[PDB]
Structure formats: C-alpha cells, structure tokens
From a paper:
Here we describe a mechanism by which an HLA-B*0702-specific acute myeloid leukemia phosphoneoantigen, pMLL747–755 (EPR(pS)PSHSM), is recognized by a cognate T cell receptor named TCR27, a candidate for cancer immunotherapy. Here we describe the crystal structures for TCR27 and for HLA-B*0702 in complex with pMLL747–755 or similar peptides. Our data show that non-covalent interactions between the epitope phosphate group and TCR27 are crucial for TCR specificity.
The wild-type (WT) MLL747–755 (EPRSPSHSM) peptide is encoded by the human gene histone-lysine N-methyl transferase 2A (KMT2A), commonly known as MLL. To exclude the influence of different crystallization conditions on protein conformation, we generated fully isomorphous (having the same space group and very similar unit cell parameters) complexes between HLA-B*0702 and the following peptides: MLL747–755, pMLL747–755, DOT1L998–1006, pDOT1L998–1006, E7P-MLL747–755 and OSE-MLL747–755. TCR27+ T cells displayed a dose-dependent increase in activation markers in the presence of pMLL747–755-treated T2 cells, whereas no activation was observed in the presence of MLL747–755. By contrast, the pMHC complexes with WT peptides MLL747–755 and DOT1L998–1006 did not interact with TCR27 (KD > 2 mM). In structures with WT MLL747–755 or DOT1L998–1006 peptides, no protein atoms interacted with the hydroxyl groups of Ser-P4. When perdeuterated 15N-labeled HLA-B*0702/ MLL747–755 complex was used as a negative control, no significant interactions with TCR27 were detected, as no changes were observed in CSPs or peak intensities in comparison with the NMR spectrum of the binary complex alone.
Numbering used by the authors:
A (entry chain C): 1 to 9
B (entry chain B): 0 to 99
C (entry chain A): 1 to 275
Write the structure that this text describes.
Amino acid sequence: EPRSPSHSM
Amino acid sequence: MIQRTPKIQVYSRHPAENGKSNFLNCYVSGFHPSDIEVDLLKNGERIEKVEHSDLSFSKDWSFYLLYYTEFTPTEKDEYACRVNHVTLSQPKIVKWDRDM
Amino acid sequence: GSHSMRYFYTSVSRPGRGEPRFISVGYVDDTQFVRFDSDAASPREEPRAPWIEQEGPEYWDRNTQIYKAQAQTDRESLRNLRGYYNQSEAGSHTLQSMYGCDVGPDGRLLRGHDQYAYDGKDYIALNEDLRSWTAADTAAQITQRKWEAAREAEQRRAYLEGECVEWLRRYLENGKDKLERADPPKTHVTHHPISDHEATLRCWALGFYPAEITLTWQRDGEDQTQDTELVETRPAGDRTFQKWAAVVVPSGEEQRYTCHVQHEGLPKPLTLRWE
Ligand SMILES: [Cl-]
Ligand code: NA
C-alpha cells in the first residue's frame, strides 16, 4: 500500500 | 533540463507463426521527458486499437512504455513502430523482424 | 528469497491546460500490481496483477484518497520548484518520486528508499539511515530544511519500517508462486546464413521471470564478449521478459559455439547449441 502524502517540497 | 533519446525494440510476444494469433510489441525506454508518440503500423498504415503499459521508469529516472496490439502475422504483412519525441529530429521508424 | 516493493510517481505540469497529470504505479519485485492516473474518468487505484484483486474495498478506497492528495501536493511542489529555480511559469516540468523497501528472506527490512528527481535529475533523497537527507543543490536544500522542520524523515522511516515491510509480506503470501518462484526461460538457438562464409547464431530466452538474466556466447568455452550482440531485456507483455544474444561465425564452425544461460529459475546454468 502507498505511503500517506508528504509535505510539499 | 535532461533530455534522453528513446531506445526502441519491436518484436512479437511469442515466436511468429504465420496465421497464428500473437501480440506485436514496441518497447520504448530510456527516454526523458515522458511526452512521446508511438504508433504501430501495418503495411505503412496506423493501427487503430493500440494499448500501452502504465508510465513507469528506471533507476536513472528514464521512462519506459510498452505499446502493443493483438495481431496474426502473415508472410506478406509488414509491421513497424513509429516514434516521435522531442529528442528526435524526425519520427523514428523501426521495422518488425520476426527473427529479432 | 529477498524481495522489494516500490512505488513510482510521475507528475508533469502543463500550465494553461489545468492541473499536473499524476500517475503512480506500484511493483513487487518485477511485477506491477497497481496503478493510478489523475486523468482517468473516475481516478482510482486499479489492480494490475491477479493476486492483489482479493484486497477488500477499504484497501482501494484508502489508496485512492492517498493518490488524490499526493497529486495535489505534487502540484504544490512543482509550483515551489519552478520558483526555486527561477523558471518560466509557462513551461512543463516533471517531478518523479520513487520509494519502497527491500527485505531479506525472513521478511525484515534490509534497506529503505525515498527519493525524487526534477526534470530527470536527482533532486533530494532519504539517506540509508532513514533519518537524514541528501540534497543535490541549493534549491533542494530549501526542500531539505522544510522537511527537517516538518520531521518528514520520521514519517518516511515509519512507513518504510512498518507498513512497507508488512504489506510486502502480505502480497508475497497472496501472490504465492507468482512472486516466490522464478519462472525459467524457454531457450532455443536459431541459425541465419549471411553469406557462403558467415552465419548468425542467435540464442533466445523467452518467458522468464524475474528480469535478471545472463546470456553469453562462448567459443571453445571462452566468452565472446567483444563479438556478441546483446539486446536489452524486454517485457513480453504478459509479466515475463525476453532477451537474446547473437554472434556471427564462419560457416562450418557453428559447432565450436555454445550459449550459456544463467537465470534464478533454472536448476543449473544451461549450455545450448545449434541443434
Ligand atoms: Cl527492434
Ligand atoms: Na521530434
């Protein structure tokens, strides 16, 4: 399963 | 900005046997950016129902796609793959050779 | 055996034509098992391998929401990066993300991965220690300081050590022989006269999995490295791969040549000849 969304760059 | 020129191979899923249903493949790889146009040709004409794999990429970030269609090879029928990409100054056409 | 899980995201901006296109694909080893495309009619995570279909609706629903959110985050990142590099707001740019876990036979984490490229160049990457970043340039150092303050590495580490390891374990249990047992290649040698004096011997490997393979031609048991034409390994389109190696030989000397095949799926390395 995919990782939860990152903070933006 | 990185640009990488696509490599192209054209080939069948199974060794070709005249009159026996198969898949014709055109594998484009090692390219960047991802925008690319790929057509399969039968006797020079664009084949209408062509599908492709989902956009993915290699460890060097270069993209690859497989374009494919069901076909039944014959003695006379000529097949090719035509690719356009920003790195190509004109469309690149690679003919299918059942021995490669 | 050792196994790996990887997710690959590609976001491509198209200013003036709407929000960036976001595509994700997921792999176990060399098998793709999921996809998402932001431009689909009703974007959702979709199965791409039979063994994943058994996961229940919650799975698909959770994953779909994650991709939708990541697409919006990537859209923000692309806006930030063009700013950091002082680039035109009119042009198209690419942000790629690659992350996942490598595990040994016991299923424990061997190495975690979380890294990014902008317009095809390495931008920032989580170090092997899973707690520090390597930035490629002063733009990426902006990202680094932002992520350091947000404790992003902690969030990455938690996934790579936890959900990544545990879900890969699950897929391996549910994929069974498809994932755990290598499929050996079907092999044969073909012969193609060029002239009265020269012929091509081509050694074929078809339908093998995983993709890693070695094909070599030997003359009297010596590698013919400088004289072998070798194609890049290529997908058959049915989850298996193909490769061939060819050598041009003097007519009448074909008997001195053998093709050698090494693949995980084979009981032992194969020696083939024209026959
Ligand atoms: Cl080709
Ligand atoms: Na072009």
